[PDB]
Write a protein that binds this ligand. Sequence first.
Ligand SMILES: CC[C@H](C)[C@H](N)C(=O)O
Ligand SMILES: [Zn+2]
Length: 917
Amino acid sequence: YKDTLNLNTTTFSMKGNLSVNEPKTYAKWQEQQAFKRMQARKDNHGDFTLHDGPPYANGHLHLGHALNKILKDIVVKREYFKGKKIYYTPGWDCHGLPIEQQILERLEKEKTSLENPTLFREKCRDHAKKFLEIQKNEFLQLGVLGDFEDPYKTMDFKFEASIYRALVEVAKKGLLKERHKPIYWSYACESALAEAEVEYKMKKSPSIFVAFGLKKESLEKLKVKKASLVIWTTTPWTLYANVAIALKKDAVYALTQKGYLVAKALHEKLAALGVVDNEITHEFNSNDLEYLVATNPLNQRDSLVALGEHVGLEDGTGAVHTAPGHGEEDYYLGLRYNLEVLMSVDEKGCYDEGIIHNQLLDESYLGEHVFKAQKRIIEQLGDSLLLEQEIEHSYPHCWRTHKPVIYRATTQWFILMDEPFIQNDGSQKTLREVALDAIEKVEFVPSSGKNRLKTMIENRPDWCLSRQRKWGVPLAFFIDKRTNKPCFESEVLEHVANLFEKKGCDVWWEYSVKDLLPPSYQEDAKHYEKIMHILDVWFDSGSTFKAVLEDYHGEKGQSPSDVILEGSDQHRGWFQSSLLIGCVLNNQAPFKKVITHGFIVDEKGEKMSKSKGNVVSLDKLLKTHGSDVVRLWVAFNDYQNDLRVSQTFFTQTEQHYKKFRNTLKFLLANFSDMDLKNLERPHNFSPLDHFMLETLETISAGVNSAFEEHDFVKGLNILMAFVTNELSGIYLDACKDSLYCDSKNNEKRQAIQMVLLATASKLCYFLAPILTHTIEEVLEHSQALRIFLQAKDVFDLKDISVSEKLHLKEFKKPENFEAVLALRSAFNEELDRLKKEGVIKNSLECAIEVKEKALDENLVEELLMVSFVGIAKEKLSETPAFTLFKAPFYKCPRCWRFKSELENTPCKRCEQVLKER
Ligand SMILES: CC[C@H](C)[C@H](N)C(=O)O
Ligand SMILES: [Zn+2]
């Protein structure tokens, strides 16, 4: 009788063959310009702008890039399917050391050089172009949709002009100022750096305690025979630049029997270390030591005893070796006392002629790198070296050369944080104040991200903008030699900006000063000289809101954006640079909302690097699992924290994907034969039908609410529980007899099919942002779904009203299945017990007599899948709720239910179906 059943099959395959079929889908969306079609949708209602943070145009995509673009894609697709016009122009960060360092390294490896600035910039620009195309196509292989054929590029000439015009706005508001002070200096790239370009890593260091003997006249003033202040330092390379020893104000300093002078609060620690001897002979107040003078044991130079602002007593000695050329707090102390700023370390981190001309350090050190010289310096200290250790400490390194940085007093350009400036509304505020106010108006997901960014703004220094490399946007101002000050005249600045817009920034190197000035100024061209520093690339990316959202007047999205979505490492990076520049231009953040994610890490939670051998390639991952599995893995996991890549976790995701896919296959298979005239007329739905429609509505609200708050785990868990439990476990098991053995003309079967159609419809809508290829495939294989949803393809999906499309009555009282589902669970646990004893094989062999008479007997029979409700003859078991019997019928050879009065004879329902004309 098997061939007399309803076939109930679909062409939608159980196997996804994802690595074969996904490229076909994505190629189609590119060929057909699906993102453009999305933006053009005629019934768009509302707008949604996600502003892409631009990856650097260097190298192939990392797993973190895929995580990022997939999450953006889910968020964007969610808004599209809610009915909005979407703005999502992806972009690329094309300048900076992330590109330039690769060129510098390749030149070195080729044993070649390239000193021509235009030709050098050309090699960098060609490298960004190459990898922009590579990353673009790799992004498209994730199934993401955006304006990838018209992306934004910081190397576009109009973009270079937009960045420069952002800088112009900073300068005209009085926040762009030169400062001279020690800052981060990367000797390996001969450039200043700021915080976002520094990576702190553990590093071993010498750690030394050094005695500076007081001069004879100072010992006479203090009335002791011997006294030497002891300092602690990890940088013997700066001892040549000492000008002072800074003490804590109004603090007691102990003089030992051997003549060492240290903070009394630290004497116990230092004597236990063996730095000084244990016997204290005299105590002195630091206020009485100020303006004594000591002698540097390295070079015999005077060192002033000074009082520092906040000298610490937790480490060291309480006497701080002070080198204004190499320490920012040292520098301010030096100026307060009108001391020399000694700085004889060149741009490559090597001692220069200054050590000879000023007698700071022996001539032999000329040309030596400061880190290389330290062993010989420590040996030169002789008896003044009281103790030498080796320690480990967290130390700043250059983000691209990975070499340790140093600090060098230098003249650079800064955006000031504590300089009051005129607000757009006419009030007066500092940038720090504006940025803190602006942070409070932004929504952070998770909300903990707010305090992370806030704390950085509270604590950050002035922002050094000027870099000494060639690949970037120049700080393209002239210094008037007649004034020694920059020219911020609007006519000059807009003349340069317009040149940049048309020709790009190459002209700043190529053109003469005269050719770069408005005609009104060319007679005075001899008085002007170009600043040749370039902008921090974090200023480039900080300006994307201006260059993309503002300068295209909303065609690429609104300013402020509705959402930005990046790694939580961008609090130190793009979030902060965009926040600061937004606050100068607009006095608010250029984003309304920040969503963050973690890092992709290995099975042990560790970062992937080539030096570790734990790198999983994005290509290998997509080839193994398929992009819809990778996308589901992202969505079905706690992406705000680090995501670990392991076989075990991807296997779990594949099982989820399989369950979703097998469920959609079953639904499609079991309404494939439905007559489409059913779609227009209403149906009489059973209580179980209604229970499922009501359950589907309740869980649909919960999936949607979870997805709205970007908690895709919570929503997918709700969806998966529904498909596993109420759908597959209860409804589809109860309906299989009718779906396969009732007549196609049976109105109860047709009503089940409509429920299955409504259920697949909701599954398609909710999974469309995540498994877009798979839902596209579902629609491709189901004509009934396409008619019912009025959908040509996945991009025509909308959130449908099941009530309206099935013609449900307005005030229908919901079903209450609590009692009958409690019976079902009790029956199934009693039935499990009888299968243990070998008494019966399945529920169909049973009759049940329910002790509660209020229950609907057909629904009991449906849900428990017994063949008979009522009393029979062979008792199997008894509970307080029900008695089970052997069903007093034969098994029907067609439907396998125990409903046949005669052996091997079709039951009454089957007999009619087999007879039907
Ligand atoms: C948001 C990205 C930022 C701007 C930077 N290009 C990076 O890849 O880290
Ligand atoms: Zn039958």
